Write a protein that binds this ligand. Structure first.
Ligand SMILES: C[C@H](Sc1nc(N)cc(Cl)n1)c1cc2ccoc2cn1
Lengths: 427, 557
């Protein structure tokens, strides 16, 4: 693509060596897709075969754009991004606008193909080695390394930052109230304009891109419009927090109140001010769980006042730019999933939900991967970083199926937890 | 020869210098042998004379070949291998026979003097310098360096297999129909051609290799299946494991049971039904290798069935890419699972078994799901696609377990298959309290310094027991208190606990555990008809909780 240029020299965080991550086994159809793709990138000089002298490895997979019959190459650079953090975080960090999260609309445009214009420091290429495995280990398996900026590495946006500024410049100057943000591979464009005017300004922005060789048909190539509206648009200013809900029954059994007292008790270590003293109501003695019970006056107040506190920002919690973001997801059933985002346990910076929404499919893994992308995306808009997920699933089942439904070009950190019987307390 | 192929550049680990180990004094006989050996190698290009301050040196030895016919030159590279860069792995896996397509003809050729037929990066040869000592270290000694891949060097396997891949590429391209597998010294060649056109194409290959520095057998091919590779016996038509033979002896030592268990595990990939549960139990407990272990009844029986299964030979068929894979899983003894994979009914491609516990507390549904994941993963590696499953579980049972379990669970396309024992949940906790059912507020305290804790309950019907315990954890008293409430309880019962720990275990419908208590609590739950479990915070004066907390904590707590 675009002309050469003195390759920006890169370097790993000393005391650390290149990645040596094993390649997860792939299905035949994904392997094939990959050799085609890699054979083409080779003919174009994007990558080159390498010998055994290279001891490095980063895994690769293959996803579908937006159901588009056109496979896309996905490289898991999580490890490399970690040993390169210095580079892309401090040395060439990219600023995150606080205004973006307040915009009426945000369109996500994929600008990854743009990275193949610039060459990568020759002394850093050995670290980008990946391997296309073969079925049943019948042959060694094709090995490669990049010659240009790879698409899943955080080093790529950092470096390309210089070009991107020149490209958007005219567009920025002519549209001072449109927020543009770049987060590895994607461009987030937001405006308070009316949908019609917004969609129109995105078209205008693509024309500018197009002149630098960045044909960017978004929503991940729309070749078949099912519920497809435009080009993949987010509406942040309408993202609302999910409160901790307290029942509102017409009858209160001992059991119902015991459960009420439990969720409240828990909601004390989070959301300061909560009280249930005047609420230990009739649950004094030894009654049958069945036995329905009346209602006190202090109670009505207790309950009413507590729910006021809850459903509100936990006073005292603030995002710390230095600490990692953690996301936890609970399986609620019937296509319902709840999640919280925090840096320090039970100090929620945000909570939410995600449902089948008159759609989705009977696959838990399916819904779960969709929830992770939704949550990661909101996280990128709001904070400028992805959270580390605590997934309620078996490591093996996840690793085997996630790529089957994944559509983003980034991959977040994830550890497999085992959900406590908390659930009842949604948050 | 020495292949004209380009060489692989290699370096020493960052910030390290070549090897320099002193040459220990050698006897005259060993010396003469080394000279006679090196001289010969020196005439074929393998090594070259050096000298002029090549600070590098690696110790050498010589030992009597088998039966003591000829000496062999042993080069101890331990010091060099450490200073040598790391390489990519030669094999991150091994083909499984069942993933092999059906071929008509197959022959194997071994590359003679493989390593010595491949040049070594010129800039690295200086580090492979070693010396032949003079009698009782008087004079200098002959000094050589390698021009090809040394026997025990860290990079020989990697560079050789990579050199061979490049040498083979051209030939492959001009022969799409020919399948070739590289395994160390050996080259496996197969095709669906006729023994005539096959051997023709074979010769064509030898020649291609010869034009590259690689010599191969003439009619010493060693081809002509059956081939014995990695414990398997491959035929162009089918496959099985090397012949298995069970000792049949009076007494068994630990060492004997291990070899036995190893053979059986290996046989279990084609021979269905193999069991080692009872045999593996005997190896439990640190026992000396030569210790005799009496076989128990179960063991005897299990060893018995195994002998039965092994008497008539069984073979596995090869893979047809145009057909589906069908995997069937049967439940054997508790925790033991076996499965078969085929494409045409009962012509098995591969066999297997799953038993792994996977945490204390679990149930047939969770185990069956875990077995399905192993098989799924395995299928992807071997055939690159998931198989359609046939499981001994009702669509209903599965549906009710998935929808109400906290963990996310998927499972590839499956069908029910009635092959007892069928899998089912053995009890269901009620979702709402049982009306007209006695409520048990159980609890349990325990003193940490003493270990004496009391487990008990209090009911809304006035009943209240409190038994003492010795050497128990705060957690056990809570599992002990629930055990009580279930004993002195009617078929229907509401139990209120303040133990999240207990709630988690029971709530997962476990039908087997490692805790002696949990297994009893399971028996009870099964005998019940309706059980409702609920939780409340400990020590918050909750209605009923404190009542029991009192006559449970009183006296160290
Ligand atoms: C090239 C041949 S294809 C082949 N097809 C058959 N139906 C039987 C045999 Cl014997 N070989 C081959 C042989 C081996 C041995 C181990 O892994 C291998 C991978 N491929």
């Amino acid at each position: 693509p675009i002309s050469p240029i003195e390759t920006v020299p890169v370097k790993l965080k000393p005391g650390m060596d290149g990645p040596k991550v094993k390649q997860w086994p792939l299905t035949e159809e994904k392997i094939k897709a990959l050799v085609e793709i890699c054979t083409e990138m080779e003919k174009e000089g994007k990558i080159s075969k390498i010998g055994p002298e290279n001891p490095y490895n980063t895994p690769v997979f293959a996803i579908k754009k937006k159901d588009s019959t056109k496979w896309r190459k996905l490289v898991d650079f999580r490890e490399l991004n970690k040993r390169t953090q210095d580079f892309w975080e401090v040395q060439l960090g990219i600023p995150h606008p606080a205004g973006l999260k307040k915009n009426k609309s945000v369109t996500v445009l994929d600008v990854g193909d743009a990275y193949f214009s610039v060459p990568l420091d020759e002394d850093f290429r050995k670290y980008t080695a990946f391997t296309i495995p073969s079925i049943n280990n019948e042959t060694p398996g094709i090995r490669y390394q990049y010659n240009v900026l790879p698409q899943g590495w955080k080093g790529s946006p950092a470096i390309f930052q210089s070009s991107m500024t020149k490209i958007l410049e005219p567009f920025k100057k002519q549209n001072p109230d449109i927020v543009i943000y770049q987060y590895m591979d994607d461009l987030y464009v937001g405006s308070d304009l009316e949908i019609g005017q917004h969609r129109t300004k995105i078209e205008e922005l693509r024309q500018h891109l197009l002149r630098w060789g960045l044909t960017t048909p978004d929503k991940k190539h729309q070749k078949e419009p099912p519920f497809l509206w435009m080009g993949y648009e987010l509406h942040p200013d309408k993202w609302t927090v999910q409160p901790i809900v307290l029942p509102e029954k017409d009858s209160w059994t001992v059991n119902d109140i015991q459960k009420l007292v439990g969720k409240l008790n828990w909601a004390s270590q989070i959301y300061p001010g909560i009280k249930v003293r005047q609420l230990c109501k009739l649950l004094r003695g030894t009654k049958a769980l069945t036995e329905v019970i009346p209602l006190t006056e202090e109670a009505e107040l207790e309950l009413a006042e507590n729910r006021e506190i809850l459903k509100e920002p936990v006073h005292g919690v603030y995002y710390d730019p230095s600490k990692d973001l953690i996301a936890e997801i609970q399986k609620q059933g019937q296509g319902q999933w709840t999640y919280q985002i925090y840096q320090e346990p039970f100090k929620n910076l945000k909570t939410g939900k995600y449902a089948r929404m008159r759609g989705a499919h009977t696959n838990d893994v399916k819904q779960l991967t969709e929830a992770v992308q939704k949550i990661t995306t909101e996280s990128i808009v709001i904070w400028g970083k992805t959270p580390k997920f605590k997934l309620p699933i078996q490591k093996e089942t996840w690793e085997t199926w996630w790529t089957e439904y994944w559509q983003a070009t980034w991959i977040p950190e994830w550890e497999f937890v085992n959900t406590p019987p908390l659930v009842k307390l949604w948050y | 020869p020495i292949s004209p192929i380009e060489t692989v550049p290699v370096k020493l680990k960052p910030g390290m210098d070549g090897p320099k180990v002193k040459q220990w004094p050698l006897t005259e006989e060993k010396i003469k042998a080394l000279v006679e050996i090196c001289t010969e190698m020196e005439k074929e290009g393998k090594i070259s004379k050096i000298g002029p301050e090549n600070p590098y040196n690696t110790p050498v030895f010589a030992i009597k070949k088998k039966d003591s016919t000829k000496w062999r030159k042993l080069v101890d590279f331990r010091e060099l291998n450490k200073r040598t860069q790391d390489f990519w792995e030669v094999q991150l896996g091994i083909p499984h026979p069942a993933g092999l397509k059906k071929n008509k003809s197959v022959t194997v050729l071994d590359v003679g003097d493989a390593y010595f037929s491949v040049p070594l990066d010129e800039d690295f040869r200086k580090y492979t310098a070693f010396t032949i000592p003079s009698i009782n270290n008087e004079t200098p000694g002959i000094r050589y360096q390698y021009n090809v891949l040394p026997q025990g060097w860290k990079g020989s396997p990697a560079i050789f297999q990579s050199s061979m891949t490049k040498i083979l590429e051209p030939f492959k391209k001009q022969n799409p129909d020919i399948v070739i597998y590289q395994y160390m010294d050996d080259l496996y060649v197969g095709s669906d051609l006729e023994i005539g056109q096959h051997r023709t194409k074979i010769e064509e290959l030898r020649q291609h290799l010869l034009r590259w520095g690689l010599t191969t057998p003439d009619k010493k091919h060693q081809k002509e299946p059956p081939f014995l590779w990695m414990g398997y016996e491959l035929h162009p038509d089918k496959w099985t494991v090397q012949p298995i033979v069970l000792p049949e002896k009076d007494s068994w030592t630990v060492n004997d049971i291990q070899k036995l268990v190893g053979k059986l595990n290996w046989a279990s990939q084609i021979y269905p039904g193999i069991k080692v549960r009872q045999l593996c139990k005997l190896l439990r407990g640190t026992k000396a290798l030569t210790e005799v272990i009496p076989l128990t009844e179960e063991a005897e029986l299990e060893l018995a069935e195994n002998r039965e299964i092994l008497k008539e030979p069984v073979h596995g068929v090869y893979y047809d890419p145009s057909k589906d894979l069908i995997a069937e899983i049967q439940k054997q003894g508790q925790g033991q699972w076996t499965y078969q994979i085929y494409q045409e009914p009962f012509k098995n491609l591969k066999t297997g078994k799953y038993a792994r516990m996977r945490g204390a507390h679990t149930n047939d549904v969770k185990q069956l799901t875990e077995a399905v994941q192993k098989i799924t993963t395995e299928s992807i590696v071997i055939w690159g696609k998931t198989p359609k499953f046939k499981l001994p579980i009702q669509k209903e049972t599965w549906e009710t377990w998935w929808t109400e379990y906290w963990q996310a669970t998927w499972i590839p396309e499956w069908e029910f298959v009635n092959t007892p024992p069928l899998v089912k949940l053995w009890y269901q906790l009620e979702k709402e309290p049982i009306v007209g059912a006695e409520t048990f507020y159980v609890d349990g305290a325990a003193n940490r310094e003493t270990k004496l804790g009391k487990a008990g309950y209090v009911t809304n019907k006035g009943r209240q027991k409190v038994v003492p315990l010795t050497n128990t954890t705060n957690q056990k008293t809570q599992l002990q208190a629930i055990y009580l409430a279930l004993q002195d309880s009617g078929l229907e019962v509401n139990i209120v606990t303040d133990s999240q720990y207990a709630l988690g275990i029971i709530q997962a419908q476990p039908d087997k555990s490692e805790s002696e208590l949990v297994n009893q609590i399971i028996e009870q739950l099964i005998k019940k008809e309706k059980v409702y479990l609920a939780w409340v915070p400990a020590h918050k004066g909750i209605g009923g909780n404190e009542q029991v907390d009192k006559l449970v904590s009183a006296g160290i707590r």
